[PDB]
Each structure stands twice: as C-alpha cells, then as structure tokens.
C-alpha cells in the first residue's frame, strides 16, 4: 500500500546510515581530579 512502501523504503537507508561513528561532546571532565 502507501505506507507499506514507505516502511520498506525507510529501511533501505537505515542499512547505509549505520556505517558512521558519531561521538558527541558530553559536558564532563576530571574536574575533581
């Protein structure tokens, strides 16, 4: 159907969207050390 095609369409890019490693900058440090 309509949303059935979109559901499998979204999975196609999900395979290629897990090839990148993202590291965020958390506001934590060795302040007490």
């Amino acid at each position: 159907s309509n949303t059935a095609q979109r559901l499998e369409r979204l999975r196609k890019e999900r395979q290629n969207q897990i090839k990148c490693k993202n590291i965020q900058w958390k506001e934590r440090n060795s302040k007490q050390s």
């Binding site: 159907s1 309509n2 949303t3 059935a4 979109r6 559901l7 979204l10 999975r11 999900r14």
Partner: protein, 131 residues
C-alpha cells in the same frame, strides 16, 4: 504523565498498564472474559513503547507537524515490529479515533500499520469456547 516527561528526555535515554483509557468494557478481547469466558491476556521494556506510540497518536490529531509524527511511528514499527501485535493496544487506538478527530490521510495512516497482524490470543480463545 508520560507526555510531559517525554519533552525533556529521549526514547533511548529512558531505557538506559501503559494504556490509559483501558477499562473492561471497551476492549475487543477484555470484554469477552466474563460474557464469553476467555482467558486473561499475557505479556518493563514493552510498557514504555505503548506510551510512546500513544502520545504520537494524540500529537497527530492537531496536524500541526504531520511529517514529524508520521516519521516517529514508522521507526518504531521497524526497530520494534512486534509492538503492533497486541489486541489491547489496537483497542485503545480504535477508542481514541472515535472521540478525537483526524484528517482522512492521517486517519488512513493509522489502522493501516495493523494490517499485517495475527491476533493469536483472540483466535485461541474463540476456538476453545466455541468447540
């Protein structure tokens, strides 16, 4: 409620009964416990997914941001395809579609993620009481 706490957190962050308007008179399966004689349904990881699914339904009733809410429901059906397989959740969604008002393209989007379901609980109980 889960609606208020959701805006300050994330779906993955929290992970690191859920039906609100669920009484024993307006459910497809729960209403047959007494009149027919069905058995009680069986089952913290899955209880936080019901609220996330439900809250996106309410936010979809305003049509302010349809694309954002529709995108959120599609991801859940991919990462957790088995969450749309409980009759009680479908009863809760169907009940909400009656009181609230939804646009036709949005209303057809709902009740369509449930097309490929089996609902084995109703089939098992109906066969036993009928035989």
């Amino acid at each position: 409620s889960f609606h208020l706490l959701r805006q300050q957190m994330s779906l993955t962050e929290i992970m690191n009964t859920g039906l609100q308007e669920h009484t024993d008179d307006n459910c497809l399966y729960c209403v047959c416990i007494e009149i027919l004689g069905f058995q009680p349904s069986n089952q913290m990881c899955r209880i936080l997914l019901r609220k996330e699914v439900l809250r996106l339904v309410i936010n979809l009733s305003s049509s302010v941001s349809t694309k954002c809410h529709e995108t959120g429901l599609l991801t859940i059906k991919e990462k957790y395809p088995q969450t749309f397989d409980d009759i009680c959740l479908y009863s809760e969604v169907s009940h909400l579609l009656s009181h609230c008002t939804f646009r036709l393209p949005c209303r057809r989007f709902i009740q369509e993620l449930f097309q490929d379901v089996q609902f084995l609980q109703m089939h098992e109980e109906a066969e036993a009481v009928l035989a």
